[PDB]
Amino acid sequence: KKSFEKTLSMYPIKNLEDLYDKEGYRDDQFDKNDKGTWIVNSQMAIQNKGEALKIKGMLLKIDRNTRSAKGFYYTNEIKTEKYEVAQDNQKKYPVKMINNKFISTEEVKEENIKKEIENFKFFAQYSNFYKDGDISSYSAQYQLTNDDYNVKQLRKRYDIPTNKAPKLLLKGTKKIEFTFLENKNENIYFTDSLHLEPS
């Protein structure tokens, strides 16, 4: 648990640029001159009944050495349980972080993608912080209510087509997941992660 608090206590980080000056856990795989890169990823996955799993998220690499951040917005559609190559639905839209905003470094023609990038917020920017697995790979999973501050935050920012209260999974080897629905071919989950890794 409080292995998560070392990270989650930081939330919210309204200005992600503060991560330039936030030190994380460095180990002998980090070179002595590498301050590290924060990899931040937030992602909503929504599957309406009889429809494909629709995914939208952003991945950002915040390089502490160069005080710059690059990554991409991404959308995807997943239809089957198993791997089908021809579902080539993954689109990536490269962005940079400039003044705590996310800026396309390419042309984006679809007005609907432009808006999503312009208004995007990572979970770390707006959040605030039973059933235990441990296979040495630990996890703790909790049943939340719809008055949980973070559940309300998700329902504002995303259109969640179920009113069931999600479970929060703290998965660690780190990564967090709000699972709203987990029926067969009817999945709704939000994930987020923030970790420091070598550049």
UniProtKB/Swiss-Prot annotation:
Domain of life according to the entry: Bacteria
Keywords attached to this entry: Cell membrane, Lipoprotein, Membrane, Palmitate, Signal
Pfam families found in the cross-reference section: DUF576
GO cellular component: plasma membrane
Main subcellular location: membrane
Localization, UniProt: Cell membrane
Name listed for the protein in its UniProt record: Uncharacterized lipoprotein SAOUHSC_00053
Species name: Staphylococcus aureus (strain NCTC 8325 / PS 47)
